[PDB]
Amino acid sequence: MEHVAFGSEDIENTLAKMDDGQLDGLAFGAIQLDGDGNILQYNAAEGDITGRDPKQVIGKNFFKDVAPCTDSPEFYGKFKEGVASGNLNTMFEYTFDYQMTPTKVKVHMKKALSGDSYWVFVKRV
Ligand SMILES: *C(=O)/C=C\c1ccc(O)cc1
The residue type found at 38 is N
CA dihedral 37, 99, 54, 29 (to 10 degrees): 80
Break the chain into its structural domains and give their ranges.
1-125
Strands (E), 12-116: 29-34, 39-42, 89-96, 103-111
The alpha carbon dihedral of 89, 94, 98, 102 has a sign of: positive
Gap from CA of 38 to ligand 1 centroid (Å)? 13
**For strand 117-124 and strand 103-111, is the pairing parallel, antiparallel, or unpaired?**
antiparallel
Reported resolution in A? 1.6
Pocket of ligand 1 (CB under 6 A): 46, 50, 52, 66-67, 69-70, 96, 98
How many alpha carbons fall within 13 Å on the CB side of residue 44?
Answer: 11
What's the distance, CA 85 to chain centroid? Answer: 19
- Which stretches of the chain are DSSP H helices? 11-15, 20-23, 44-50, 54-57, 76-85
Beta bridge partners of 83: none
Structure determination technique employed:
X-ray
**The residue count for the chain:** 125
Q: Which CATH architecture has domain 1-125?
A: 2-Layer Sandwich (3.30)
